[PDB]
PDB file of C-alpha atoms in Angstrom:
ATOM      1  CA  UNK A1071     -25.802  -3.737  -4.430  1.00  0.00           C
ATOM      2  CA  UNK A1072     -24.315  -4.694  -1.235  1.00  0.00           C
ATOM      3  CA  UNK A1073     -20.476  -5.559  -0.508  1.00  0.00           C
ATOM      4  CA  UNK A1074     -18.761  -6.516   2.616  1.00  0.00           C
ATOM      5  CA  UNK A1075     -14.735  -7.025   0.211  1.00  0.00           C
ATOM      6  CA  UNK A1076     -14.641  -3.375   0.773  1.00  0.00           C
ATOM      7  CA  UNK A1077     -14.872  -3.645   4.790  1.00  0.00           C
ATOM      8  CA  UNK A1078     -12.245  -5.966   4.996  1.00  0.00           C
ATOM      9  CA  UNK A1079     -10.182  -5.076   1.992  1.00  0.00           C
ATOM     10  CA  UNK A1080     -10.002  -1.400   4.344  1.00  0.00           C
ATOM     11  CA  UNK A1081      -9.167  -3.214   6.649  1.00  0.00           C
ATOM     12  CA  UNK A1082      -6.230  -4.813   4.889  1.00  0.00           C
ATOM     13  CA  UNK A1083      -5.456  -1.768   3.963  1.00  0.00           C
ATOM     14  CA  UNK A1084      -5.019  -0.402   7.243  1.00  0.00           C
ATOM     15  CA  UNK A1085      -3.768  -2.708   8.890  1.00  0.00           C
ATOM     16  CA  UNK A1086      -0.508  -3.107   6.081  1.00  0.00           C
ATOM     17  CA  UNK A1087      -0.484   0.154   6.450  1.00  0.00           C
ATOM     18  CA  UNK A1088       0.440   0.058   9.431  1.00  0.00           C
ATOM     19  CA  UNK A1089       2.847  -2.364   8.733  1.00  0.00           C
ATOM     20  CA  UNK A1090       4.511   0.266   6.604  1.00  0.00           C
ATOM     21  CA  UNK A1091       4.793   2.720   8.747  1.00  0.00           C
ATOM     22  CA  UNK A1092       5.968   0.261  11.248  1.00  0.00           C
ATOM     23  CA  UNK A1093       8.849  -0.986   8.596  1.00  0.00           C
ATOM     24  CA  UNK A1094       9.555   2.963   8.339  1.00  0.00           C
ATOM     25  CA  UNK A1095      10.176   3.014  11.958  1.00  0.00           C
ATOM     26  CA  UNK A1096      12.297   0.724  12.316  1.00  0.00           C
ATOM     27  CA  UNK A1097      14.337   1.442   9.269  1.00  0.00           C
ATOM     28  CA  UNK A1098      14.573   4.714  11.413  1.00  0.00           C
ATOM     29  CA  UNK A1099      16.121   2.908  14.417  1.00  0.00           C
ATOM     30  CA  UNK A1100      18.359   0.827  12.247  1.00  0.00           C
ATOM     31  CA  UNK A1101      19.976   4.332  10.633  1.00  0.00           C
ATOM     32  CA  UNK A1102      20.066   5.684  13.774  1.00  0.00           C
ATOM     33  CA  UNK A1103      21.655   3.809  15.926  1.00  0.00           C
ATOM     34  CA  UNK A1104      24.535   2.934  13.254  1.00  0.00           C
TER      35      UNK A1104
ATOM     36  CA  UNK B1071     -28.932 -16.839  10.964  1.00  0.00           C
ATOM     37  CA  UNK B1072     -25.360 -18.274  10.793  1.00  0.00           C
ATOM     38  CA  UNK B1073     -22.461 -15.690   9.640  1.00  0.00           C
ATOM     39  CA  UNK B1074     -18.388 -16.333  10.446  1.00  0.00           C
ATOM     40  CA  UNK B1075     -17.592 -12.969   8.994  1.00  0.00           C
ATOM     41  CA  UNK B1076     -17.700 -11.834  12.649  1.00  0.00           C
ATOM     42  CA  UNK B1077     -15.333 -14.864  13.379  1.00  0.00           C
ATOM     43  CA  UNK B1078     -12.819 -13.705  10.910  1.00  0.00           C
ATOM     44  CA  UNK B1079     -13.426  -9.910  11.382  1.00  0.00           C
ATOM     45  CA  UNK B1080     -12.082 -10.477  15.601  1.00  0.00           C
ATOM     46  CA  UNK B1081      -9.276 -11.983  14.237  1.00  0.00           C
ATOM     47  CA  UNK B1082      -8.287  -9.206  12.038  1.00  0.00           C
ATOM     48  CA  UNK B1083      -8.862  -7.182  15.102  1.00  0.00           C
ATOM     49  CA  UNK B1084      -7.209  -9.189  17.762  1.00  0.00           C
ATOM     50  CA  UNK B1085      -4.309  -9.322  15.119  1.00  0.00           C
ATOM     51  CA  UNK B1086      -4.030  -5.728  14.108  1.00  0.00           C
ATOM     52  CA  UNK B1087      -5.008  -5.004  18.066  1.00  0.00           C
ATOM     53  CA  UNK B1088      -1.205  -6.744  18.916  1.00  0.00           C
ATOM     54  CA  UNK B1089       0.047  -4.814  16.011  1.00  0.00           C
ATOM     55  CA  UNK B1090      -1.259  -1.828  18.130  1.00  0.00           C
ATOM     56  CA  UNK B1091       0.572  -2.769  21.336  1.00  0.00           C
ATOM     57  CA  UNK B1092       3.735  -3.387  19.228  1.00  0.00           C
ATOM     58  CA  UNK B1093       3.397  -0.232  17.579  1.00  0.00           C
ATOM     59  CA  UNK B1094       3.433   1.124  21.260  1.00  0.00           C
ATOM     60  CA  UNK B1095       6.426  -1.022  22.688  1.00  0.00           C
ATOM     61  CA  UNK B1096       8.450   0.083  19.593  1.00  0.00           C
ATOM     62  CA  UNK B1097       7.557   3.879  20.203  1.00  0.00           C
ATOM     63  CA  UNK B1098       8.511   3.131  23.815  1.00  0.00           C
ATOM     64  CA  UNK B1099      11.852   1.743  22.973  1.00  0.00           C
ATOM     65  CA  UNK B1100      12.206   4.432  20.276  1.00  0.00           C
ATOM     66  CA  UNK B1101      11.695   7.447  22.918  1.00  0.00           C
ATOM     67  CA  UNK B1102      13.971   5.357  25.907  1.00  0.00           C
ATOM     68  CA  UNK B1103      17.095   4.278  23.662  1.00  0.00           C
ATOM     69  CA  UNK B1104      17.748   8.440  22.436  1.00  0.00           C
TER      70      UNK B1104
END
């Protein structure tokens, strides 16, 4: 049994991950600098 | 042998790469603004 979804569902996964942690960060700047 | 997964794969890389230099310029104006 052999799969390459995995690899790049990982990869979405990272990479929206990312893209959360990114939104976090600039939720941060938006409290903070209000 | 013909694949484009390796097509497709750089582009999640190139993409997620400029994620990764965004990430950094929004650190860098996170650390220089406080």
């Amino acid at each position: 049994a052999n799969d390459n979804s995995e690899e790049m569902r990982h990869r979405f996964r990272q990479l929206d991950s990312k893209l959360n942690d990114l939104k976090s960060l600039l939720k941060e700047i938006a409290n903070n600098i209000k």
